[model samples]
Target: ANEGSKTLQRNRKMAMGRKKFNMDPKKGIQFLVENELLQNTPEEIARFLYKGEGLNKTAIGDYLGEREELNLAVLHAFVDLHEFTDLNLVQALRQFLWSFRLPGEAQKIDRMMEAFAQRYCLCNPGVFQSTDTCYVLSFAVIMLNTSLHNPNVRDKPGLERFVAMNRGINEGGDLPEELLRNLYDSIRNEPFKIP
Candidate 1:
């Protein structure tokens, strides 16, 4: 009887762990739908994507304050993807983001690294192992958007429009040329500092 009880307890623990990791993929999908990026919006998308007790005021503020509406839209897509998609989905998204580049634009490895370190490394300290890959991948997309849109970038023109949509930035601000150039440089050269 004791042995059977122990087995049941172990099974319960396992079930709990599985429940925690078994995040609803629909949430991610809904995020995409809400941003108008998904074809079919799931019924549970809103609940799943925005699950959590307390509100993230900072993130909400950033969302609202974004200069480009498209940027916010894209971010909504990403958040949905992150919330519901598996590792494979995440990887595919990263690959898509990295596929494009300006033909003659110099690969700026140093700046990329600096931006990575400053944004992901600094903002997310001690939690790198858990989400570093995803963070970097998402950051890469943001970089691509910046590079594509900057008037000085001299590459793709509509990229900025897409970026603005993703970031929810309504009013354009600083030029993305130097920022993207620096980010590219940083990603190529600097060692990722995980503190």
Candidate 2:
């Protein structure tokens, strides 16, 4: 116990210590930043966030507001692939929303549930480990619509499909027991179709 405390204290000191140089990754860009004294420009900072891992409103606002780069097809596509990668659950939804926006008509939800149950096991809202699984699954159904707005990002399903699907619904929001389970299932079964 005492040893653990000492290690943490040492780590804290090292982190607080002045570094020789700072090298943060550019947002969405596939490069490193040398913000030696935190003098990175807006473009740099935006890209720094662009390359960051995960999907959330903070980054979406930064990317859209500061750079307006979200409208850029090439950059947006590249960014989606780099950040919200299908290769991993990079920027998954934090929490499911209460009033959700769904696509493919009301029946899409029923169809989605059917697809999910068949693809996995005999899973349903009641079978879920967490009550929130219902929310995440329901919330996830409407996430893919954002790609419809950005042609650059829509073509490649590996990029923003999960991010837009999840973040588009859960942004500025706030999960379930089987919480991580359904979330993981939602993640693995990310939509390839946009809008």
Candidate 3:
């Protein structure tokens, strides 16, 4: 019975995760449009209905200018939050971005961002001010999860300091204290939590 209950719990969690990944297109599209990332141009509309950008390295401004189709599947796979596997946070993030493209992959990118935001919330508590935070955190989380993969890179000096300083913050230190607290808590509880 205990085993059954655990399985049930795991299944429930998996379902929830999958549901989070399956965002409604209308709602998602509206969110993107409101953010000024979408438009009514024939090409823009076509691209929106078709391909979506996955997790690429192109700047958002450049993506907007190109107005391309995005692949939602690749994006979903990129940021779909799971127990960090063998890959560390940095490697996972890099892998995700490595697969991302621009213009023709906008929808996927948007979906990836959505999944990333949801997963991030589960792992940490805070409101991200920009998509850039999502990218950085994804990388950080991947590195944290997979530190064992590459010991040489894992224990390098200055890496911890660099990650500590790279946290989400604005000038004047107006960053949310909750974020800092969560970060500290993760670090205190487990060094792997810190990117």
Candidate 4:
């Protein structure tokens, strides 16, 4: 009858099989650690991934302005595994600037910004981003301007190209659908606007 009943391992559940992204905070952190892409502590990493934990408290600002790297590869994992969009990154980064303020440690800040662009995107020649999303797209524009304003930042090469963009958004131009999507994406921008 029950040849395998003695073991009684039937109802056990496992959440693994395919390489799906884990949305839980701890799970997300574990995903990073498991892939060997971090040098942060458990709680610290969890704070970043958990949302509402490491965000909006000058944590990212401190991490960013300090001239240290927060490992964009960790962010890379988010895009690949979860629904985390570049727009999400734009908001968090903007929030961090609000809380921490900027223009810190010139040389270090310059180095940090360079590293960020390296891992960000390379769409329109040093563009390093996707315009399909609004907040993120605007974030890219903001950063370009920031570098232009900050002499210490060593603005990315071809950074000024954006000023001459066609329609200045999608490069080529936003279609009706992209127009609506970008508009919706922009709803979250003002909160990030700085004085």
Provide the lDDT at 163 for model 4.
Answer: 34
Model 1, residue 24: displacement in angstroms? 33
State candidate 1's TM-score.
0.21
lDDT of 2 by residue, 84-137 (tens): 223212132222111122233445444333333232222232333433443454
Mind giving the per-residue lDDT tens digits that candidate 3 earns over 145-185? 35534466656323444346565444223345454445434
From the highest lDDT down, the ranking of the candidates is 3, 4, 1, 2
Find the 10 residues in a row with the least total lDDT in model 2: 92-101
The regions of model 2 sitting more than 4 angstroms off are 1-104, 111-127, 130-135, 141-195
> What digit string (tens of lDDT, one per residue) describes model 1 on residues 2-106?
999977865565444323323432343334454444344332332332342232323322322233544334334434333222223223333332322212222
1-195 in candidate 4: lDDT tens per residue?
475762343211112201122333334334545654433553444344334333333333333333223434433332232222343335434543443333446664454344334333431232323433333354454655454455787744352244334243544554244433343344323434552
Our tally of clashes for model 1 stands at 41
Tell me each candidate's TM-score. Answer: 0.21, 0.21, 0.31, 0.30
Each candidate structure's count of clashing pairs: 41, 17, 33, 2
Cα lDDT of all candidates, in order? 0.37, 0.35, 0.43, 0.39
Best of the two (1, 3) by lDDT: 3
